[PDB]
Write a protein that binds this ligand. Structure first.
Ligand SMILES: Nc1ncnc2c1ncn2[C@@H]1O[C@H](COP(=O)(O)OP(=O)(O)OP(=O)(O)O)[C@@H](O)[C@H]1O
Ligand SMILES: Nc1ncnc2c1ncn2[C@@H]1O[C@H](COP(=O)(O)OP(=O)(O)OP(=O)(O)O)[C@@H](O)[C@H]1O
Ligand SMILES: Nc1ncnc2c1ncn2[C@@H]1O[C@H](COP(=O)(O)OP(=O)(O)OP(=O)(O)O)[C@@H](O)[C@H]1O
Ligand SMILES: [Mg+2]
Ligand SMILES: [Mg+2]
Ligand SMILES: [Mg+2]
Ligand SMILES: [Zn+2]
Ligand SMILES: [Zn+2]
Lengths: 373, 591, 580
């Protein structure tokens, strides 16, 4: 996806592997092939033939000072959040969560490093645009609407979008309109990071380790606050509980906020650019570079911080029990807290998590649960 | 014009055998058999294989080896023999049916090496397809050269002539079928499976398709066990081929004197001692149910069901049921399924099934579309599979209303008339039914009537000979004894059973006793009358009232008890014991 | 010698005869005598015996099976005409070697193995009715009925296209019945899941059984099949003679084997660790280390892994006894139910994991589907005949699947009405079900039946119902957080080997002390219920658990300690689902 032009789609080349090179590649593998490009004749002004690539070697592949100074800035992270789709006014915390997803977990050993996020909201709140922007910014990206999972074409395995993610990010718009089988598949993806598929009674397991960014709309129109979750939406509650972060976006008519949004849109239409902000949004390439730099690190969690993390967890769980409506609190929540903290540590380029990161993760989690208010 | 010397010699020898072979009386039996065959609806003549083997061993060997090759010539010989003898219709189909074949192969043993040779197999019919005329010797006319192609035999498929008749013309693609001139024969596709006797434990049975024609078309009905004498053949299927057993003759599978003569000296001595063994009733009950404690009445009733009464058909074509039906309503656990499993395991012809079965048959005969043929076929259900046997149905309270009404009709009329999708049949089903059920809510409320305790419809309850209520007593001694039985069974893996009679001995004794048909003595008649007088006078409160249906059940149980000792006449002992059993089975409201 | 090999017919036959006569564990002569009376003309030989006796002969046999087996057949026939020189048999003896080259890495198979005898272990998935394949076609002229025969026309049949007596044009049609056929059965067999290291894509192979050995393996049977590897061309179009440059490959079976462990070191080690007084508790702790604070549930699942001793009640006439242990873990979401199910499925061999939803990729049922041959496809329950079926989301199931589960848990078999025939696939599986209560949380004061809404009979079939909840306890939350964070910043192999050894070797048997203890415990339970009382099914569960615990201790006989442990565990489960 890196080499694909912005306004085009990936192209395919058939490769004929033979000899010892066989059984050296799997679907979804980001590989490099050295071989001879030759035609296969399986007649306008000459013969016409289909081409292939006779493989010979297959190998599975895996700044300036001012840049570092900017990285050292405390607002640096916030700045990056502002750069996530600047034209999308508001949703700052949502953008921050998306950035955390983009930087991912650490998987210190192993821990599932993917940070699955879901955005449930009324129609017309920029969800699809956000998903598209993430697909454009994440180095390895897939976009889908609901195929997603692998298939057995007739006799060849064909990786679905989920497989093509393979440590990338799979942005699934219109999540609420996904087939039940697909729901089960994504459940398995979030549980083991593998896809099990069987067409002729053969359970084949493929490595699909990819963060999931889902978007959904409440059924029967806009979300009804008086109706509990899964009442305005038709998704299994457990599946939602799987996601590390679940954000509810409500298009509440607020004259002030609505006016602000209108002003923003008008400025865009009158200048083809978003209104000027405190920090100019960074170019996508630079964002990707910083993301990769963050992926370099694998910060640790000092045992001392454990005490505070446990305290926070017990506090929030007690609050949830005090809350009349169950807020999906469970060990999953603690795991997500840890993942978010380590992702923030990656953003800080510090191999040791800090109180700051834990507090920020807790704040994001609280804000999601409040968004369900 | 090529003459098969084998075929012609076989035809000559077969005609000679027909016109010379004679019975012990010195007369040609087949002459009289054919004379009987002249009548309408009689187009198949049976022939004893052993008889022709004695007449000519070489002829029998050749026919066995090449039965399919020579069969048409045998039919031609029969046609010639019958045509010149008497006033038979000048042109109607005739066939020869062979029997008395000593070699009885198993469906497992049917291999391609046996294709085309005569053989006899034994199986159980599963489903039966509608009759259908099929062209055997088609006649066509070439469109271009308008010449009539005749006798273009088809091998069970739409085989048009290879090329025109005329050497001059080579249309080869536009032959027109002459329906009137074409020769047709009525074929019925049946499916059979390995009988449970030959079925290996835990092995899927072999399903074999067979073709019935002529007199055998309607001979075999769904759900019955039959032996087919015929020849395995191949049929092309959309160079693919599949096996089908074209059966020339169909007969039912396999008297007291006959059994005793056939029975071995030691076995007959054992059975004679059994008959002369007093108190054989309780002894046999205990032997047949070792892993059980208490519930002596349930075991008594089950044994009486196993024996069965004497069926009777009135002069007005009314069938009086001879076998009895038993139901066991019990609290959770209490070994109901254990009773049914024991009955199924001990008795051949007994089939165990559950009221939760989702099979298209649904515990009775049904009509279902074949997945491939898409033609409605009468599929036999478990109840049919228990023909002249026992059907141990568990979860009887949980049966569907469809199966419930079907079973009601079956137990009422002893036959199921199934009509749907244009198909119609009347399948005989004389099957003793042993049902297991649970009280509504799980526990039996002894202060409520039986109706309030079970969801079964009134007709089903009325048509049951005996209801046995199994209440989980809180008595410490009973629970201690049950624990003793179970623990002794599990520790002493075997040898814990104390069978005064072996299972095979019990089976052979039951078969011997079945041959008897006990009659009712005038003393027995008046004793039955007086017992029913007392039962009516009781008039209570009892869970279910007492009607003439109870009197019928009483007489059937008395017949079964008479059969127990093999005595050919009823005695007051049997009647009084049956009265005791039925009266005890009645439970009064404890409110 | 035959071209391109090292094989001499006379010398090879003499060497095979020497192997038959001169050998030490003579068994071949014994089974030759057995065949005499039996008449079964198939001399099965373990190729490893030839390897030990003569490695050169074993190599020669493997390299050129098709050319060497007839020599062995001839030698065996000559011997049978030497020993018991007088006898009657429809066809002379045949030899079907086996267990020669365990290249069971079916995923790792090479074209170098073409036309070489190989043995592979796997579970047959599908079969088909025996196919009659022509070997001597018979033809008759439509004009003059000139009979003619064409014998072994290299698979296809050479149509004469011209008669031989009238010599007319092409008019001689084949007569199917007059022809000659041989039996050929097709089987589709899947690679054994256990043997695969990765198992990302389970491998499948096609087998052909010719002229014999037909229908000897039923669907779902785990067997070792030894046969000749074969590659045959596939024509692009039947009309044209062009063939694909890539051959499709199959196996021509020669022998079927329906189916010590490790070394003395492993048996010694397992015995040593068994001697530990707390081996039971230590094994429980080792199981599923990720889980925390759960002990009764872990002990129950461990006993299920070991299961009760196999018992034969055929003589008693009581039918098969369910020696397997079925455990239902009922709990609110987030109690680590699915983690335990996956861990158990990831530990026990030949285990199966499935979801109660019909959307499960495996499916808890078997059914017939068109290939377009309407052939059966097995379910998870039948698939794990002797393994453990970990059912997740067991609460959400359709009534038909509930009936199927009831049938399998009762009779240990599944009845399927294919076409019209009813087939009873034996499935003696161990059911480990997980259920999540309806509604967001579990409402107290309501029975498990009310809060799960499953049939009372079906849950009564289960021998242990373990209720697990997330307590609203700050101390428990703190402990769990500490455990998880510690996990953030005994190897299963030895446990698996211990379980395998216990299953293979030991078979607990009851004892008089154990019998009396069982009786006393049951009567005490009855008395307690005098005031959901006791049932004999509870006694069956207690005896099965006691047998399993004895198996864990390797006592080989049920002991009063086992009875006490079983009673305590059962009482704990009762308490878990108890209410009053
Ligand atoms: N908060 C926002 N800030 C800026 N633009 C917004 C915002 N919310 C919505 N929009 C604008 O709404 C326009 C149309 O709606 P949009 O594409 O965002 O729908 P959506 O939320 O993806 O809807 P759905 O999921 O129902 O298809 C987009 O061009 C986007 O620019
Ligand atoms: N009265 C009894 N005497 C001896 N054994 C008994 C008795 N009642 C129950 N049992 C034992 O109970 C064990 C379990 O009972 P079983 O499973 O056969 O019950 P069931 O009749 O199928 O129950 P239900 O249909 O009500 O669920 C059986 O092995 C049987 O040995
Ligand atoms: N008592 C416990 N000890 C250890 N880990 C626990 C415990 N309770 C919960 N967990 C952890 O909580 C998470 C629960 O995940 P899992 O999907 O297995 O839960 P579940 O209760 O089976 O869920 P569900 O019923 O929704 O499918 C896992 O991290 C599990 O390790
Ligand atoms: Mg949208
Ligand atoms: Mg039962
Ligand atoms: Mg779970
Ligand atoms: Zn013509
Ligand atoms: Zn000719």
């Amino acid at each position: 996806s890196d080499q694909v032009p912005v306004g085009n789609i990936p192209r395919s080349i058939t490769v004929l592997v033979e000899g010892e090179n066989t059984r050296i590649a799997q679907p979804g593998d980001h590989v490099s092939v050295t071989g001879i490009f030759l035609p296969i004749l399986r007649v306008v002004q000459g013969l016409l033939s289909e081409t292939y690539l006779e493989a010979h070697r297959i190998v599975k592949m895996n700044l300036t000072r001012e840049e570092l100074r900017q990285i050292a800035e405390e607002d640096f992270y916030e700045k990056l959040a502002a750069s996530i789709a600047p034209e999308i006014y508001g949703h700052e915390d949502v953008k921050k969560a998306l950035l955390l997803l983009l930087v991912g977990g650490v998987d210190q050993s192993k821990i599932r490093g993917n940070i699955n996020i879901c955005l449930m909201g009324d129609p017309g709140v920029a969800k699809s645009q956000l998903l598209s922007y993430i697909d454009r910014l994440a180095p390895r990206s897939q976009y889908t609407t609901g195929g997603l999972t692998a298939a057995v074409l007739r006799l060849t395995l064909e990786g679905g979008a989920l497989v093509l993610a393979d440590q990338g990010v799979c942005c699934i718009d219109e999540f609420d309109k996904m087939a039940e089988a697909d729901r089960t598949a994504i459940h398995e993806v979030m549980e083991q990071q593998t896809i099990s598929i069987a067409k002729a009674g053969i359970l084949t397991t493929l490595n699909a380790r990819c963060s999931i960014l889902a978007a959904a709309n409440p059924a029967y129109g806009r979300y009804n606050p008086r109706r509990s979750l899964e009442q305005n939406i038709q998704l299994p509650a457990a599946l939602l509980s799987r996601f590390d972060l679940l954000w509810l976006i409500q298009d509440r008519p607020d004259r002030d906020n609505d006016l602000r949004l209108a002003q923003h849109i008008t400025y865009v239409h009158q200048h083809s650019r978003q209104p000027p902000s405190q920090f100019e949004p960074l170019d996508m390439k630079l964002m990707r570079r910083y993301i990769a730099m963050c992926r370099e690190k694998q910060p640790m969690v000092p045992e001392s911080l454990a005490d505070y993390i446990t305290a926070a967890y017990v506090e929030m769980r007690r609050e949830a029990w005090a809350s009349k409506d169950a807020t999906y609190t469970s060990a999953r929540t603690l795991l997500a807290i840890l993942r978010l903290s380590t992702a923030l540590a990656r953003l800080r380029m510090v191999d040791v998590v800090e109180k700051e990161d834990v507090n920020e993760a807790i704040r994001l989690m609280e804000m999601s649960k409040d968004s369900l208010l | 014009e090529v003459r098969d010397e084998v075929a012609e010699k076989c035809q000559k020898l077969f005609l000679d055998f027909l016109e010379e072979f004679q019975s012990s009386d010195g007369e040609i039996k087949y002459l009289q058999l054919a004379e009987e065959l002249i009548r309408p609806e009689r187009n198949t003549l049976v022939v004893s294989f052993v008889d022709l083997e004695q007449f000519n061993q070489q002829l029998s060997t050749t026919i066995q080896e090449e039965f399919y090759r020579v069969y048409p010539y045998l039919c031609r010989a029969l046609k010639t023999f019958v045509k010149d003898r008497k006033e038979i219709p000048l042109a109607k189909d005739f066939y020869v049916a062979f029997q008395d074949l000593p070699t009885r192969h198993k469906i497992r043993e049917l291999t391609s090496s046996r294709i085309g040779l005569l053989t006899r197999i034994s199986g159980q019919v599963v489903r039966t397809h509608p009759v259908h005329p099929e062209l055997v010797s088609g006649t066509f006319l070439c469109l271009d050269c308008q010449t009539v192609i005749r006798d273009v035999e088809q091998q069970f498929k739409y085989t048009q002539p290879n090329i025109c008749r005329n050497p001059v013309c080579a249309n080869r693609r536009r032959f027109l079928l002459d329906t009137n001139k074409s020769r047709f024969v009525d074929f019925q596709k049946v499916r059979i499976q390995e009988t449970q006797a030959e079925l290996p434990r835990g092995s899927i049975p072999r399903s074999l398709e067979v073709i019935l024609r002529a007199e055998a078309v309607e001979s075999a009905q769904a759900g019955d066990k039959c032996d087919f004498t015929g020849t395995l053949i191949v049929v092309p299927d959309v160079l693919s081929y599949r096996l089908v057993f074209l059966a020339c003759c169909v007969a039912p599978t396999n008297t007291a004197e006959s059994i005793k003569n056939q029975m071995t000296v030691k076995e007959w001595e054992k059975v004679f001692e059994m008959s002369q063994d007093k108190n054989l009733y309780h002894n046999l009950c205990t032997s047949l149910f070792p892993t059980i404690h208490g519930n002596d009445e349930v075991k008594r009733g089950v044994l009486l069901m196993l024996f069965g009464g004497v069926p009777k058909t009135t002069g007005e074509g009314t069938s009086l049921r001879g076998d009895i039906n038993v139901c066991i309503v019990g609290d959770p656990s209490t070994a109901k399924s254990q009773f049914l499993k024991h009955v199924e395991e001990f008795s051949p012809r007994a089939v165990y099934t559950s009221g939760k079965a989702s099979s298209a048959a649904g515990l009775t005969a049904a009509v279902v579309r074949d997945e491939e043929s898409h033609e409605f076929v009468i599929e036999a259900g478990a109840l049919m599979l228990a023909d002249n046997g026992v059907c141990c149905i568990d979860e009887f309270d949980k049966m569907d209303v469809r199966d419930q009404v079907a079973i009601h009709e079956a137990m009422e009329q002893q036959t199921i008339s199934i009509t749907k999708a244009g198909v119609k049949a009347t399948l005989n089903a004389r099957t003793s039914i042993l049902a297991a059920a649970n009280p509504i809510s799980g526990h039996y409320d002894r202060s409520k009537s039986l109706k309030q305790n079970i969801n079964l419809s009134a007709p089903i309850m009325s048509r049951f000979d005996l209801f046995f209520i199994l209440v989980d007593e809180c008595n410490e001694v009973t629970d201690y004894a049950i624990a003793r039985r179970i623990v002794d069974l599990h520790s002493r893996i075997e040898e814990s059973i104390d069978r005064v009679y072996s299972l095979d001995d019990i089976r052979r004794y039951l078969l011997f006793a079945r041959q008897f048909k006990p009659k009712i003595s005038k003393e027995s008649e008046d004793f039955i009358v007086e017992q029913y007088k007392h039962l009516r006078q009781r008039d209570g409160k009892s869970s279910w009232r007492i009607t003439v249906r109870q009197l019928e059940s009483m007489i059937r149980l008395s017949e079964a008890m008479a059969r127990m000792h093999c005595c050919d006449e009823v005695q007051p002992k049997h009647v009084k014991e049956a009265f005791r059993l039925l009266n005890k089975s009645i439970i009064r409201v404890e409110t | 010698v035959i071209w391109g090999t090292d094989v001499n017919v006379a010398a090879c036959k003499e060497n095979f005869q020497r192997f038959l006569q001169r050998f030490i564990d003579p068994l071949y002569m014994q089974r030759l005598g057995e065949i005499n009376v039996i008449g079964e003309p198939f001399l099965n030989v373990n190729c490893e015996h030839i390897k030990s006796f003569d490695k050169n002969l074993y190599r020669q046999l493997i390299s050129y099976p098709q050319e060497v087996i007839p020599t062995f057949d001839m030698a065996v026939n000559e011997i049978f005409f030497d020993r018991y020189p007088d006898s009657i048999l429809e066809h002379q003896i045949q030899v079907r070697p086996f267990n020669a080259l365990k290249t069971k890495n079916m995923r790792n198979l090479n074209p170098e193995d073409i036309d070489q005898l190989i043995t592979i272990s796997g579970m047959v998935i599908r079969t088909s009715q025996l196919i009659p394949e022509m070997q001597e076609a018979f033809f008759q002229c439509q004009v003059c009925a000139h009979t003619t025969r064409v014998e072994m026309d290299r698979g296809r049949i050479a149509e004469p296209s011209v008669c031989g007596r009238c010599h007319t044009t092409h008019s001689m049609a084949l007569i199917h019945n007059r022809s000659l056929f041989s039996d050929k059965q097709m089987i589709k067999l899947q690679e054994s899941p256990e043997d695969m290291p990765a198992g990302q894509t389970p491998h499948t192979v096609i087998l052909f059984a010719h002229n014999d050995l037909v229908d000897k393996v039923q669907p779902g049977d785990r067997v070792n099949v030894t046969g000749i590897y074969r590659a045959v061309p596939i024509r692009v179009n039947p009309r044209v003679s062009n063939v694909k440059s890539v051959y499709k490959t199959h196996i021509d079976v020669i022998h079927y084997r329906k189916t010590k462990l490790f070394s003395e070191k492993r048996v010694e080690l397992l015995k040593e660790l068994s001697r530990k007084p707390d081996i039971y508790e230590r094994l429980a702790s080792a199981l599923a280390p990720s889980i925390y604070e759960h002990e009764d549930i872990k002990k129950g699942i461990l006993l299920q892994l070991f299961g009760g001793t196999r018992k034969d009640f055929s003589h008693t006439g009581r039918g098969k006894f369910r020696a397997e242990i079925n455990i239902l873990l009922c709990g609110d979401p987030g109690t680590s139910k699915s983690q335990l199910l996956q861990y158990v499925y990831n530990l026990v061999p030949r285990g199966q994991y499935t979801s109660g939803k019909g959307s499960s990729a495996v499916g808890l049922t078997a059914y017939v589907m068109k290939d377009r041959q309407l052939v059966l496809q097995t379910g998870a329950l039948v698939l794990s005949d002797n393994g453990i079926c970990c059912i997740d989301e067991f609460d959400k199931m359709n009534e038909s699947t509930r009936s199927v589960l009831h049938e399998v848990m009762e009779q240990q078999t599944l009845s399927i009405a294919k076409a019209g025939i009813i087939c009873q696939l034996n499935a003696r599986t161990s059911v480990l079900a997980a259920a999540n209560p309806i509604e967001s949380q579990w409402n107290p004061k309501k029975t498990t039946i009310e809060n799960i809404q499953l049939p009372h009979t079906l849950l009564s079939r289960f021998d242990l119902i373990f209720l697990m909840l997330d307590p609203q306890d700050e101390a428990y939350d703190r402990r769990l957080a500490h455990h998880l964070v510690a996990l953030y910043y005994l190897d299963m192999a030895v446990l698996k080997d211990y379980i395998a050894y216990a299953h293979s070797t030991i078979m607990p048997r009851l004892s008089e002390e154990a019998s009396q203890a069982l009786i006393e415990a049951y009567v005490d339970m009855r008395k307690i219920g005098s005031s959901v009382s006791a049932y004999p099914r509870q006694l069956e569960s207690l005896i099965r658990l006691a047998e399993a615990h004895a198996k864990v201790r390797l006592s080989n006989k049920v002991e009063a300690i086992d009875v006490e442990e079983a009673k305590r565990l059962h009482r704990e489960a009762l308490k878990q689902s108890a209410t009053d």
